[PDB]
Design a protein around this ligand. Sequence first.
Ligand code: HEM
Lengths: 55, 438
Amino acid sequence: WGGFSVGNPTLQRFFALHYLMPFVLAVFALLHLIALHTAGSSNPLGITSNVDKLS
Amino acid sequence: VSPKTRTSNLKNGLTIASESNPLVQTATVGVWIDAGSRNENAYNNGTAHFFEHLAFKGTDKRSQHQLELDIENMGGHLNAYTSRESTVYYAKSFKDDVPKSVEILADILQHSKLAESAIDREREVITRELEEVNKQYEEVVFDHLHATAFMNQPLGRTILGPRENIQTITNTELRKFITENYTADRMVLVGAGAVDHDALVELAEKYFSHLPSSQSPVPLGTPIPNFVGSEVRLRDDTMPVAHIAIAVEGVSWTSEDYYTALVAQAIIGNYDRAVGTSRHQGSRLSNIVSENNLANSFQSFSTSYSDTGLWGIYLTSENTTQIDDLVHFTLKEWNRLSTSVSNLQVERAKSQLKAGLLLSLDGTTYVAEDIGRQLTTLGRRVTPAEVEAKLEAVTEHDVRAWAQKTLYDKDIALVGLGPIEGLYDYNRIRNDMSMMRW
Ligand code: HEM
Protein backbone atom coordinates (compact mmCIF):
# COMPACT_ATOMS: atom_id res chain seq x y z
CA TRP A 1 0.00 0.00 0.00
CA GLY A 2 2.89 2.35 0.83
CA GLY A 3 0.94 3.37 3.92
CA PHE A 4 -1.65 2.10 6.33
CA SER A 5 -4.58 1.81 3.97
CA VAL A 6 -5.29 2.01 0.27
CA GLY A 7 -4.67 5.62 -0.69
CA ASN A 8 -2.65 7.91 -2.93
CA PRO A 9 0.65 5.91 -2.73
CA THR A 10 -1.19 2.76 -3.72
CA LEU A 11 -2.92 4.41 -6.64
CA GLN A 12 0.30 5.87 -8.02
CA ARG A 13 2.12 2.58 -7.78
CA PHE A 14 -0.79 0.71 -9.38
CA PHE A 15 -0.63 3.13 -12.27
CA ALA A 16 3.06 2.49 -12.89
CA LEU A 17 2.61 -1.28 -12.60
CA HIS A 18 -0.56 -1.33 -14.69
CA TYR A 19 1.39 0.41 -17.45
CA LEU A 20 4.25 -2.09 -17.14
CA MET A 21 2.43 -5.41 -16.77
CA PRO A 22 1.00 -5.51 -20.36
CA PHE A 23 4.56 -5.32 -21.71
CA VAL A 24 5.56 -8.23 -19.51
CA LEU A 25 2.45 -10.07 -20.64
CA ALA A 26 3.39 -9.49 -24.30
CA VAL A 27 6.83 -10.97 -23.68
CA PHE A 28 5.33 -14.11 -22.08
CA ALA A 29 2.82 -14.38 -24.92
CA LEU A 30 5.72 -14.37 -27.31
CA LEU A 31 7.59 -16.95 -25.20
CA HIS A 32 4.71 -19.39 -25.24
CA LEU A 33 4.54 -19.12 -29.05
CA ILE A 34 8.25 -19.71 -29.48
CA ALA A 35 7.93 -22.72 -27.18
CA LEU A 36 4.98 -23.97 -29.28
CA HIS A 37 6.91 -23.65 -32.51
CA THR A 38 8.93 -26.76 -31.78
CA ALA A 39 5.88 -29.07 -31.99
CA GLY A 40 3.58 -26.81 -34.01
CA SER A 41 -0.14 -26.32 -33.33
CA SER A 42 -2.13 -29.33 -32.24
CA ASN A 43 -5.34 -29.96 -34.21
CA PRO A 44 -8.89 -31.09 -33.37
CA LEU A 45 -8.28 -34.77 -34.20
CA GLY A 46 -5.32 -35.01 -31.84
CA ILE A 47 -3.13 -36.71 -34.46
CA THR A 48 0.06 -35.55 -36.14
CA SER A 49 -0.32 -32.92 -38.83
CA ASN A 50 3.18 -33.56 -40.16
CA VAL A 51 1.50 -35.55 -42.97
CA ASP A 52 -0.59 -32.55 -44.20
CA LYS A 53 0.47 -28.96 -43.63
CA LEU A 54 -0.92 -25.66 -44.91
CA SER A 55 0.89 -22.29 -44.87
CA VAL B 1 18.64 -21.86 -99.17
CA SER B 2 17.05 -25.32 -98.88
CA PRO B 3 15.33 -26.94 -101.95
CA LYS B 4 11.64 -26.18 -102.55
CA THR B 5 9.01 -28.53 -101.09
CA ARG B 6 7.00 -29.93 -103.98
CA THR B 7 3.33 -30.75 -103.37
CA SER B 8 0.82 -32.69 -105.49
CA ASN B 9 -2.62 -34.20 -104.92
CA LEU B 10 -4.32 -37.36 -106.15
CA LYS B 11 -8.00 -37.53 -107.15
CA ASN B 12 -9.11 -39.04 -103.83
CA GLY B 13 -7.49 -36.04 -102.11
CA LEU B 14 -4.29 -37.60 -100.85
CA THR B 15 -1.51 -35.02 -100.64
CA ILE B 16 2.02 -35.93 -101.73
CA ALA B 17 4.78 -33.66 -100.44
CA SER B 18 8.48 -34.10 -100.99
CA GLU B 19 11.81 -32.42 -100.36
CA SER B 20 14.83 -33.87 -102.21
CA ASN B 21 18.43 -33.71 -100.96
CA PRO B 22 20.91 -34.96 -103.64
CA LEU B 23 23.71 -35.08 -101.04
CA VAL B 24 22.23 -37.96 -99.02
CA GLN B 25 21.77 -41.60 -99.98
CA THR B 26 18.92 -42.53 -97.63
CA ALA B 27 15.24 -41.50 -97.82
CA THR B 28 12.40 -41.25 -95.32
CA VAL B 29 8.96 -41.86 -96.88
CA GLY B 30 5.85 -42.10 -94.77
CA VAL B 31 2.22 -41.27 -94.15
CA TRP B 32 1.24 -38.45 -91.82
CA ILE B 33 -2.39 -38.66 -90.73
CA ASP B 34 -4.46 -35.87 -89.26
CA ALA B 35 -6.05 -38.23 -86.70
CA GLY B 36 -5.08 -39.52 -83.27
CA SER B 37 -6.40 -40.40 -79.81
CA ARG B 38 -8.50 -37.24 -79.74
CA ASN B 39 -10.77 -38.81 -82.34
CA GLU B 40 -11.80 -41.57 -79.96
CA ASN B 41 -14.68 -41.30 -77.49
CA ALA B 42 -14.54 -42.57 -73.92
CA TYR B 43 -15.56 -46.11 -74.85
CA ASN B 44 -12.97 -46.75 -77.55
CA ASN B 45 -10.20 -44.66 -76.00
CA GLY B 46 -6.99 -46.56 -76.71
CA THR B 47 -8.04 -47.80 -80.17
CA ALA B 48 -5.59 -45.66 -82.17
CA HIS B 49 -2.71 -46.92 -80.05
CA PHE B 50 -4.02 -50.48 -80.29
CA PHE B 51 -4.08 -50.23 -84.09
CA GLU B 52 -0.44 -49.11 -84.22
CA HIS B 53 0.48 -52.48 -82.60
CA LEU B 54 -1.68 -54.48 -85.02
CA ALA B 55 -0.42 -52.66 -88.09
CA PHE B 56 2.79 -54.67 -87.71
CA LYS B 57 1.05 -57.96 -86.90
CA GLY B 58 0.34 -59.10 -90.49
CA THR B 59 -1.72 -58.18 -93.56
CA ASP B 60 -3.98 -60.04 -95.99
CA LYS B 61 -0.88 -61.02 -98.06
CA ARG B 62 2.20 -61.03 -95.83
CA SER B 63 1.94 -62.78 -92.46
CA GLN B 64 3.65 -61.37 -89.35
CA HIS B 65 6.82 -63.30 -90.23
CA GLN B 66 6.74 -62.39 -93.91
CA LEU B 67 6.32 -58.72 -92.95
CA GLU B 68 9.40 -58.96 -90.68
CA LEU B 69 11.42 -60.60 -93.46
CA ASP B 70 10.32 -58.12 -96.15
CA ILE B 71 11.52 -55.15 -94.09
CA GLU B 72 14.71 -56.95 -93.04
CA ASN B 73 15.41 -57.55 -96.75
CA MET B 74 14.78 -53.88 -97.57
CA GLY B 75 17.62 -53.02 -95.20
CA GLY B 76 16.15 -49.98 -93.47
CA HIS B 77 13.46 -49.86 -90.80
CA LEU B 78 9.83 -48.88 -90.25
CA ASN B 79 8.57 -46.73 -87.40
CA ALA B 80 5.22 -45.40 -86.16
CA TYR B 81 3.82 -43.17 -83.43
CA THR B 82 0.36 -42.14 -82.33
CA SER B 83 -0.23 -38.83 -80.59
CA ARG B 84 -3.38 -36.97 -79.51
CA GLU B 85 -3.90 -35.31 -82.89
CA SER B 86 -1.47 -37.00 -85.27
CA THR B 87 -0.48 -40.49 -86.38
CA VAL B 88 2.72 -41.17 -88.36
CA TYR B 89 3.94 -44.32 -90.17
CA TYR B 90 7.24 -44.02 -91.95
CA ALA B 91 10.02 -46.06 -93.50
CA LYS B 92 13.68 -45.12 -93.67
CA SER B 93 15.50 -46.90 -96.47
CA PHE B 94 18.12 -46.70 -99.20
CA LYS B 95 17.51 -44.48 -102.23
CA ASP B 96 16.43 -47.33 -104.49
CA ASP B 97 14.42 -49.22 -101.85
CA VAL B 98 11.77 -46.50 -101.78
CA PRO B 99 9.20 -48.34 -103.98
CA LYS B 100 9.38 -51.34 -101.61
CA SER B 101 8.83 -49.20 -98.54
CA VAL B 102 5.88 -47.31 -100.03
CA GLU B 103 4.31 -50.64 -100.95
CA ILE B 104 4.75 -52.06 -97.46
CA LEU B 105 3.29 -48.93 -95.83
CA ALA B 106 0.30 -48.97 -98.18
CA ASP B 107 -0.27 -52.60 -97.27
CA ILE B 108 -0.17 -52.28 -93.49
CA LEU B 109 -2.52 -49.27 -93.56
CA GLN B 110 -5.13 -50.50 -96.01
CA HIS B 111 -5.01 -54.27 -95.80
CA SER B 112 -4.22 -55.24 -92.20
CA LYS B 113 -5.68 -58.50 -90.90
CA LEU B 114 -6.65 -57.47 -87.32
CA ALA B 115 -7.11 -61.16 -86.54
CA GLU B 116 -8.92 -61.98 -83.25
CA SER B 117 -5.93 -64.12 -82.24
CA ALA B 118 -3.57 -61.14 -82.59
CA ILE B 119 -5.96 -58.75 -80.83
CA ASP B 120 -5.95 -61.18 -77.91
CA ARG B 121 -2.16 -61.50 -77.87
CA GLU B 122 -1.51 -57.71 -77.92
CA ARG B 123 -4.17 -57.16 -75.29
CA GLU B 124 -1.61 -58.44 -72.76
CA VAL B 125 1.38 -56.56 -74.19
CA ILE B 126 -0.53 -53.29 -73.99
CA THR B 127 -1.77 -54.16 -70.50
CA ARG B 128 1.90 -54.47 -69.43
CA GLU B 129 2.64 -51.03 -70.97
CA LEU B 130 0.26 -49.51 -68.39
CA GLU B 131 2.65 -50.60 -65.61
CA GLU B 132 5.96 -49.49 -67.19
CA VAL B 133 5.28 -45.92 -68.38
CA ASN B 134 5.38 -45.38 -64.58
CA LYS B 135 9.17 -45.17 -64.94
CA GLN B 136 9.23 -42.47 -67.65
CA TYR B 137 8.73 -39.56 -65.29
CA GLU B 138 8.51 -36.84 -67.89
CA GLU B 139 5.74 -38.76 -69.67
CA VAL B 140 3.92 -39.41 -66.41
CA VAL B 141 4.06 -35.70 -65.67
CA PHE B 142 2.87 -34.61 -69.08
CA ASP B 143 0.06 -37.11 -69.22
CA HIS B 144 -1.25 -35.94 -65.86
CA LEU B 145 -0.81 -32.38 -67.06
CA HIS B 146 -3.14 -32.93 -70.04
CA ALA B 147 -5.58 -34.91 -67.92
CA THR B 148 -6.02 -32.06 -65.46
CA ALA B 149 -5.72 -29.06 -67.82
CA PHE B 150 -8.39 -30.49 -70.09
CA MET B 151 -10.37 -32.24 -67.38
CA ASN B 152 -13.06 -34.58 -68.85
CA GLN B 153 -12.39 -33.45 -72.39
CA PRO B 154 -10.93 -35.47 -75.34
CA LEU B 155 -7.50 -33.78 -75.12
CA GLY B 156 -7.39 -34.85 -71.49
CA ARG B 157 -7.48 -38.58 -72.29
CA THR B 158 -4.32 -40.67 -72.46
CA ILE B 159 -3.20 -42.40 -75.65
CA LEU B 160 -3.03 -45.91 -74.08
CA GLY B 161 -6.57 -45.58 -72.77
CA PRO B 162 -7.98 -47.19 -69.59
CA ARG B 163 -7.28 -50.86 -68.64
CA GLU B 164 -11.01 -51.56 -69.09
CA ASN B 165 -10.97 -50.57 -72.78
CA ILE B 166 -7.86 -52.57 -73.53
CA GLN B 167 -9.76 -55.68 -72.41
CA THR B 168 -12.80 -54.87 -74.58
CA ILE B 169 -11.31 -53.52 -77.84
CA THR B 170 -12.64 -55.64 -80.74
CA ASN B 171 -11.49 -55.98 -84.35
CA THR B 172 -14.84 -54.35 -85.25
CA GLU B 173 -14.10 -51.12 -83.42
CA LEU B 174 -10.51 -51.14 -84.67
CA ARG B 175 -11.76 -51.43 -88.26
CA LYS B 176 -14.40 -48.77 -87.67
CA PHE B 177 -11.81 -46.36 -86.29
CA ILE B 178 -9.43 -46.66 -89.22
CA THR B 179 -12.26 -46.53 -91.74
CA GLU B 180 -13.67 -43.31 -90.35
CA ASN B 181 -10.35 -41.58 -89.72
CA TYR B 182 -7.68 -42.85 -92.13
CA THR B 183 -9.20 -41.17 -95.17
CA ALA B 184 -7.33 -39.73 -98.10
CA ASP B 185 -8.22 -36.12 -97.39
CA ARG B 186 -6.64 -36.49 -93.93
CA MET B 187 -3.43 -38.15 -95.11
CA VAL B 188 -0.15 -36.88 -96.49
CA LEU B 189 2.47 -39.04 -98.20
CA VAL B 190 5.79 -37.43 -97.43
CA GLY B 191 9.22 -38.09 -98.89
CA ALA B 192 12.48 -36.51 -97.77
CA GLY B 193 16.09 -37.16 -98.77
CA ALA B 194 16.91 -39.13 -101.89
CA VAL B 195 13.40 -39.19 -103.38
CA ASP B 196 12.11 -37.90 -106.68
CA HIS B 197 8.75 -36.15 -106.32
CA ASP B 198 7.44 -37.45 -109.65
CA ALA B 199 8.44 -41.00 -108.72
CA LEU B 200 6.68 -40.69 -105.37
CA VAL B 201 3.48 -39.41 -107.02
CA GLU B 202 3.48 -42.47 -109.31
CA LEU B 203 3.92 -44.80 -106.32
CA ALA B 204 1.02 -42.99 -104.63
CA GLU B 205 -1.18 -43.55 -107.69
CA LYS B 206 -0.23 -47.22 -107.59
CA TYR B 207 -0.79 -47.97 -103.93
CA PHE B 208 -2.93 -45.31 -102.34
CA SER B 209 -5.43 -44.66 -105.09
CA HIS B 210 -8.20 -46.87 -103.66
CA LEU B 211 -8.30 -44.94 -100.33
CA PRO B 212 -11.77 -43.83 -99.08
CA SER B 213 -12.51 -40.12 -99.18
CA SER B 214 -14.46 -38.63 -96.27
CA GLN B 215 -18.05 -37.46 -96.93
CA SER B 216 -17.30 -33.88 -95.78
CA PRO B 217 -13.66 -32.97 -96.68
CA VAL B 218 -12.54 -30.21 -94.32
CA PRO B 219 -9.05 -28.64 -94.92
CA LEU B 220 -5.99 -30.26 -93.32
CA GLY B 221 -5.43 -29.23 -89.70
CA THR B 222 -9.06 -28.44 -88.93
CA PRO B 223 -10.18 -29.07 -85.28
CA ILE B 224 -14.09 -26.35 -77.66
CA PRO B 225 -11.29 -26.89 -75.05
CA ASN B 226 -12.06 -25.29 -71.72
CA PHE B 227 -8.85 -25.19 -69.63
CA VAL B 228 -9.18 -26.05 -65.92
CA GLY B 229 -6.77 -24.38 -63.48
CA SER B 230 -5.95 -27.33 -61.25
CA GLU B 231 -3.25 -29.47 -59.72
CA VAL B 232 -2.22 -33.11 -59.44
CA ARG B 233 0.22 -34.05 -56.69
CA LEU B 234 1.86 -37.45 -56.90
CA ARG B 235 4.08 -37.29 -53.89
CA ASP B 236 6.64 -40.09 -53.60
CA ASP B 237 9.18 -39.53 -50.86
CA THR B 238 11.30 -42.43 -52.03
CA MET B 239 12.12 -40.71 -55.34
CA PRO B 240 15.25 -38.48 -55.15
CA VAL B 241 14.24 -36.07 -57.94
CA ALA B 242 11.08 -33.91 -58.00
CA HIS B 243 9.46 -33.41 -61.42
CA ILE B 244 7.17 -30.40 -61.75
CA ALA B 245 5.26 -29.03 -64.72
CA ILE B 246 3.42 -25.72 -64.68
CA ALA B 247 1.41 -24.61 -67.69
CA VAL B 248 -1.23 -22.14 -68.79
CA GLU B 249 -3.50 -22.44 -71.79
CA GLY B 250 -1.31 -21.65 -74.80
CA VAL B 251 -1.83 -21.16 -78.53
CA SER B 252 -3.02 -23.30 -81.43
CA TRP B 253 -1.01 -23.91 -84.61
CA THR B 254 -2.86 -21.23 -86.47
CA SER B 255 -3.04 -18.64 -83.71
CA GLU B 256 -1.90 -15.14 -84.61
CA ASP B 257 0.18 -15.34 -81.43
CA TYR B 258 1.97 -18.53 -82.42
CA TYR B 259 5.32 -16.80 -82.96
CA THR B 260 4.86 -14.45 -80.04
CA ALA B 261 4.42 -17.49 -77.79
CA LEU B 262 7.64 -19.05 -79.22
CA VAL B 263 9.62 -15.90 -78.60
CA ALA B 264 8.31 -15.66 -75.04
CA GLN B 265 9.25 -19.31 -74.48
CA ALA B 266 12.77 -18.59 -75.78
CA ILE B 267 13.22 -15.70 -73.34
CA ILE B 268 12.90 -18.18 -70.46
CA GLY B 269 14.63 -20.99 -72.34
CA ASN B 270 16.08 -24.28 -71.12
CA TYR B 271 18.73 -25.27 -68.67
CA ASP B 272 20.60 -28.46 -67.78
CA ARG B 273 23.35 -28.62 -65.15
CA ALA B 274 25.04 -31.45 -67.05
CA VAL B 275 25.69 -29.34 -70.12
CA GLY B 276 28.85 -27.22 -69.85
CA THR B 277 27.51 -24.09 -71.52
CA SER B 278 24.34 -23.87 -69.42
CA ARG B 279 25.96 -21.90 -66.59
CA HIS B 280 26.70 -19.10 -69.04
CA GLN B 281 23.30 -18.71 -70.73
CA GLY B 282 21.74 -15.24 -71.04
CA SER B 283 18.32 -16.18 -69.61
CA ARG B 284 17.64 -14.64 -66.21
CA LEU B 285 15.99 -17.81 -64.88
CA SER B 286 18.98 -19.83 -66.03
CA ASN B 287 21.29 -17.51 -64.05
CA ILE B 288 19.16 -17.65 -60.88
CA VAL B 289 18.79 -21.41 -61.04
CA SER B 290 22.41 -22.17 -61.79
CA GLU B 291 23.87 -19.76 -59.18
CA ASN B 292 21.63 -21.11 -56.44
CA ASN B 293 21.65 -24.82 -57.45
CA LEU B 294 17.89 -24.81 -57.56
CA ALA B 295 17.37 -27.45 -60.23
CA ASN B 296 19.03 -30.14 -62.32
CA SER B 297 17.13 -28.94 -65.34
CA PHE B 298 14.25 -26.98 -66.72
CA GLN B 299 12.69 -26.97 -70.19
CA SER B 300 10.24 -24.34 -71.42
CA PHE B 301 7.64 -25.62 -73.83
CA SER B 302 4.88 -24.31 -76.02
CA THR B 303 2.77 -27.26 -77.21
CA SER B 304 0.13 -26.50 -79.88
CA TYR B 305 -2.97 -28.36 -80.98
CA SER B 306 -5.55 -27.53 -83.61
CA ASP B 307 -7.70 -25.46 -81.24
CA THR B 308 -5.66 -24.89 -78.05
CA GLY B 309 -2.21 -25.41 -76.56
CA LEU B 310 -0.25 -25.54 -73.31
CA TRP B 311 2.59 -23.11 -72.63
CA GLY B 312 4.74 -23.66 -69.57
CA ILE B 313 7.83 -25.17 -68.06
CA TYR B 314 9.01 -28.56 -66.88
CA LEU B 315 11.46 -28.57 -63.92
CA THR B 316 13.55 -31.29 -62.30
CA SER B 317 15.21 -30.80 -58.95
CA GLU B 318 16.95 -32.68 -56.13
CA ASN B 319 16.91 -29.59 -53.98
CA THR B 320 13.93 -30.59 -51.93
CA THR B 321 14.11 -27.76 -49.39
CA GLN B 322 14.17 -25.07 -52.05
CA ILE B 323 11.40 -26.18 -54.38
CA ASP B 324 9.54 -23.11 -53.14
CA ASP B 325 12.43 -20.88 -54.34
CA LEU B 326 12.61 -22.66 -57.67
CA VAL B 327 8.89 -22.21 -58.30
CA HIS B 328 8.91 -18.66 -56.93
CA PHE B 329 11.78 -17.55 -59.19
CA THR B 330 10.35 -19.28 -62.22
CA LEU B 331 6.99 -17.55 -61.89
CA LYS B 332 8.61 -14.19 -61.17
CA GLU B 333 10.48 -14.54 -64.49
CA TRP B 334 7.14 -15.17 -66.19
CA ASN B 335 5.75 -12.02 -64.50
CA ARG B 336 8.53 -10.04 -66.19
CA LEU B 337 7.27 -11.03 -69.64
CA SER B 338 4.29 -8.82 -68.73
CA THR B 339 5.98 -6.06 -66.80
CA SER B 340 9.62 -5.65 -67.83
CA VAL B 341 10.64 -7.20 -71.12
CA SER B 342 12.02 -4.78 -73.62
CA ASN B 343 13.72 -4.90 -76.98
CA LEU B 344 16.81 -6.26 -75.23
CA GLN B 345 15.35 -9.72 -74.43
CA VAL B 346 13.00 -9.83 -77.42
CA GLU B 347 15.72 -9.21 -80.02
CA ARG B 348 18.03 -11.71 -78.38
CA ALA B 349 15.31 -14.43 -78.43
CA LYS B 350 14.42 -13.68 -82.05
CA SER B 351 18.11 -14.10 -83.05
CA GLN B 352 18.29 -17.46 -81.28
CA LEU B 353 14.99 -18.67 -82.88
CA LYS B 354 15.68 -17.61 -86.45
CA ALA B 355 18.51 -20.17 -86.39
CA GLY B 356 16.81 -22.67 -84.06
CA LEU B 357 13.83 -23.29 -86.38
CA LEU B 358 16.22 -24.18 -89.21
CA LEU B 359 18.81 -26.08 -87.10
CA SER B 360 16.20 -28.60 -85.88
CA LEU B 361 15.91 -30.02 -89.41
CA ASP B 362 19.26 -31.80 -89.70
CA GLY B 363 18.32 -35.26 -91.10
CA THR B 364 15.83 -36.82 -93.56
CA THR B 365 13.58 -37.99 -90.75
CA TYR B 366 13.52 -34.51 -89.22
CA VAL B 367 12.76 -32.97 -92.59
CA ALA B 368 10.00 -35.50 -93.23
CA GLU B 369 8.60 -34.88 -89.78
CA ASP B 370 8.63 -31.15 -90.46
CA ILE B 371 6.88 -31.45 -93.81
CA GLY B 372 4.35 -33.90 -92.37
CA ARG B 373 3.60 -31.85 -89.26
CA GLN B 374 3.22 -28.57 -91.17
CA LEU B 375 1.02 -30.12 -93.87
CA THR B 376 -1.31 -31.75 -91.35
CA THR B 377 -1.58 -28.70 -89.03
CA LEU B 378 -1.45 -25.73 -91.41
CA GLY B 379 -2.29 -27.31 -94.76
CA ARG B 380 0.98 -26.06 -96.28
CA ARG B 381 4.73 -26.06 -95.71
CA VAL B 382 5.77 -22.60 -94.62
CA THR B 383 8.94 -21.44 -96.40
CA PRO B 384 11.88 -20.19 -94.21
CA ALA B 385 11.43 -16.72 -95.74
CA GLU B 386 7.86 -16.54 -94.41
CA VAL B 387 8.99 -17.86 -91.04
CA GLU B 388 11.74 -15.25 -90.90
CA ALA B 389 9.17 -12.53 -91.65
CA LYS B 390 6.69 -13.73 -89.00
CA LEU B 391 9.46 -13.84 -86.37
CA GLU B 392 10.62 -10.37 -87.37
CA ALA B 393 7.10 -9.07 -86.90
CA VAL B 394 7.22 -9.96 -83.18
CA THR B 395 7.92 -6.81 -81.16
CA GLU B 396 8.41 -6.28 -77.43
CA HIS B 397 4.95 -4.76 -77.40
CA ASP B 398 3.53 -8.00 -78.82
CA VAL B 399 5.30 -10.07 -76.17
CA ARG B 400 4.07 -7.85 -73.32
CA ALA B 401 0.56 -7.76 -74.71
CA TRP B 402 0.51 -11.55 -75.13
CA ALA B 403 1.89 -12.21 -71.66
CA GLN B 404 -0.61 -9.83 -70.09
CA LYS B 405 -3.53 -11.76 -71.57
CA THR B 406 -2.11 -15.28 -71.32
CA LEU B 407 0.11 -15.44 -68.27
CA TYR B 408 -0.52 -12.51 -66.02
CA ASP B 409 -2.78 -13.42 -63.07
CA LYS B 410 -4.04 -16.55 -64.88
CA ASP B 411 -4.90 -20.02 -63.60
CA ILE B 412 -2.22 -22.65 -64.02
CA ALA B 413 -2.29 -26.39 -64.32
CA LEU B 414 0.34 -27.85 -62.05
CA VAL B 415 1.65 -31.39 -61.71
CA GLY B 416 4.20 -32.45 -59.14
CA LEU B 417 5.78 -35.89 -58.87
CA GLY B 418 8.29 -37.18 -56.31
CA PRO B 419 9.55 -35.53 -53.08
CA ILE B 420 7.30 -32.46 -53.39
CA GLU B 421 6.49 -31.78 -49.76
CA GLY B 422 8.14 -28.36 -50.30
CA LEU B 423 5.82 -27.51 -53.17
CA TYR B 424 3.26 -25.12 -51.62
CA ASP B 425 -0.51 -25.39 -52.10
CA TYR B 426 -2.28 -24.16 -55.25
CA ASN B 427 -3.01 -20.61 -53.96
CA ARG B 428 0.57 -19.77 -53.07
CA ILE B 429 1.76 -21.01 -56.46
CA ARG B 430 -1.01 -19.19 -58.33
CA ASN B 431 -0.33 -15.99 -56.33
CA ASP B 432 3.08 -15.85 -57.97
CA MET B 433 1.35 -15.34 -61.33
CA SER B 434 1.17 -11.63 -60.57
CA MET B 435 3.31 -9.06 -58.82
CA MET B 436 1.84 -6.78 -56.17
CA ARG B 437 4.53 -4.16 -56.94
CA TRP B 438 3.12 -3.75 -60.48
C1 HEM C 1 -2.18 -12.82 -24.05
C2 HEM C 1 -2.71 -14.03 -24.03
C3 HEM C 1 -2.45 -14.99 -25.12
C4 HEM C 1 -2.19 -14.83 -26.47
C5 HEM C 1 -2.09 -13.54 -27.29
C6 HEM C 1 -2.06 -16.17 -26.99
C7 HEM C 1 -1.82 -16.44 -28.36
C8 HEM C 1 -1.75 -17.73 -28.87
C9 HEM C 1 -1.64 -18.05 -30.25
C10 HEM C 1 -1.62 -17.03 -31.38
C11 HEM C 1 -1.56 -19.41 -30.37
C12 HEM C 1 -1.45 -20.16 -31.67
C13 HEM C 1 -2.86 -20.16 -32.30
C14 HEM C 1 -3.96 -20.81 -31.48
O1 HEM C 1 -3.90 -22.02 -31.17
O2 HEM C 1 -4.96 -20.18 -31.10
C15 HEM C 1 -1.61 -19.97 -29.07
C16 HEM C 1 -1.49 -21.35 -28.82
C17 HEM C 1 -1.53 -21.77 -27.48
N1 HEM C 1 -1.72 -21.06 -26.33
FE1 HEM C 1 -2.00 -19.18 -26.21
N2 HEM C 1 -2.20 -17.07 -26.01
C18 HEM C 1 -2.41 -16.43 -24.86
C19 HEM C 1 -2.68 -16.94 -23.61
C20 HEM C 1 -2.63 -18.30 -23.32
C21 HEM C 1 -2.93 -18.92 -22.10
C22 HEM C 1 -3.46 -18.25 -20.84
C23 HEM C 1 -2.64 -20.27 -22.25
C24 HEM C 1 -2.76 -21.38 -21.28
C25 HEM C 1 -3.22 -21.36 -20.02
C26 HEM C 1 -2.19 -20.50 -23.56
C27 HEM C 1 -1.80 -21.76 -23.97
C28 HEM C 1 -1.64 -21.94 -25.33
C29 HEM C 1 -1.37 -23.28 -25.83
C30 HEM C 1 -1.23 -24.55 -25.04
C31 HEM C 1 -1.31 -23.18 -27.16
C32 HEM C 1 -1.09 -24.30 -28.14
C33 HEM C 1 -2.48 -24.79 -28.52
C34 HEM C 1 -2.41 -25.59 -29.79
O3 HEM C 1 -2.22 -25.03 -30.91
O4 HEM C 1 -2.69 -26.78 -29.70
N3 HEM C 1 -2.22 -19.28 -24.17
N4 HEM C 1 -1.72 -18.92 -28.16
